[PDB]
Design a protein around this ligand. Sequence first.
Ligand SMILES: [Mg+2]
Ligand SMILES: [Mg+2]
Ligand SMILES: [Mg+2]
Ligand SMILES: [Mg+2]
Lengths: 206, 206
Amino acid sequence: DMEIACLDLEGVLVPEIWIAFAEKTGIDALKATTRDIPDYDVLMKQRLRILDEHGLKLGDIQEVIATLKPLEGAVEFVDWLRERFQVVILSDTFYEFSQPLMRQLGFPTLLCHKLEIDDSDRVVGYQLRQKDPKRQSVIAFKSLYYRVIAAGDSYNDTTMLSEAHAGILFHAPENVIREFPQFPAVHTYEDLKREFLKASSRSLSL
Amino acid sequence: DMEIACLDLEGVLVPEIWIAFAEKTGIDALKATTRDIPDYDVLMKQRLRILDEHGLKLGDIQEVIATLKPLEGAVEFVDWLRERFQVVILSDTFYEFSQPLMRQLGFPTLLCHKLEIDDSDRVVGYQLRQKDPKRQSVIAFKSLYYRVIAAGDSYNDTTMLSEAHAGILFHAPENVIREFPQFPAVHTYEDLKREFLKASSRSLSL
Ligand SMILES: [Mg+2]
Ligand SMILES: [Mg+2]
Ligand SMILES: [Mg+2]
Ligand SMILES: [Mg+2]
């Protein structure tokens, strides 16, 4: 009966940060995701190039991300979940990029990657923490004898969902839902609550 | 590099929960200690029996514990820490006893043990998650390539502190302080902040 709820960040609790950053700054180029560029090391090399070409330092970038908001209903959902589970966020975001949004969620433990910042505050590099990081985080909780219930919205979440004791697709695209019928797929926070209740070994209230 | 701050709960952020609870009830028989009964299983079995004899269901217990508050300054300290680190609380108490205190700290991730609750809300047993749970939690975060900075107040916390990359003693007894000089020993939240800054590999502000 010892359970950790692991959540993806972008698309589950907050908007896709780079697309939202692109929308705020008018830099259309930054709307690009893995659907356009598969290799995260390349995409991260590129995104950082574009930022530097626009003279956007870390402080500048954080100013923009500070104007973003959690998805409607997301904070209430996190509050509900924290009353019932230990809540850990597993994301391929970066600490320095996501900080203003994480504050609005009450800074739940976040397991993600980091940036490399020079003495002039420029984003020159990044470090991926490890391979298959969300799956490996689930393994770490299993080593502590936790049952893990995980929710994610995209293909890059399916290893986490498969490794967990129970996985839930939230707001997932139809292709993903069709490819992974083993996970319940829901698209409202209330329904997501109900899937956490179904997956739990405990008797919990909605 | 990437840093998790692990905090012991009781004595660092909140009062010793069992002892405070037993005092608040006025029931002398609930006040027996590990000194009176050094076998923990026998002690816990006795506690559960006396609770039941006095009709104290989980809801009654939590109502009493909900009158406890975090130590003066602990709320601010947790907030300060969450701006700078990923924060995880480690404890040898039970989820059901800590829940009303955790709520007051914004429900940071808590890795601890669990009680067994029957359908009538009676406390009918307990489950320890694993041996040396705090030390093993540090090992789990190391398996995800985190550097761990830990703080604790007791002799038993020293396994956790030794396992961490940096350990800090907070409100520790003289015997612990002197036998473990490798951990800086402090007793105010401001000094605790300063020890987290010293232990960090990153440039962080007070
Ligand atoms: Mg996502
Ligand atoms: Mg999505
Ligand atoms: Mg303690
Ligand atoms: Mg103490």
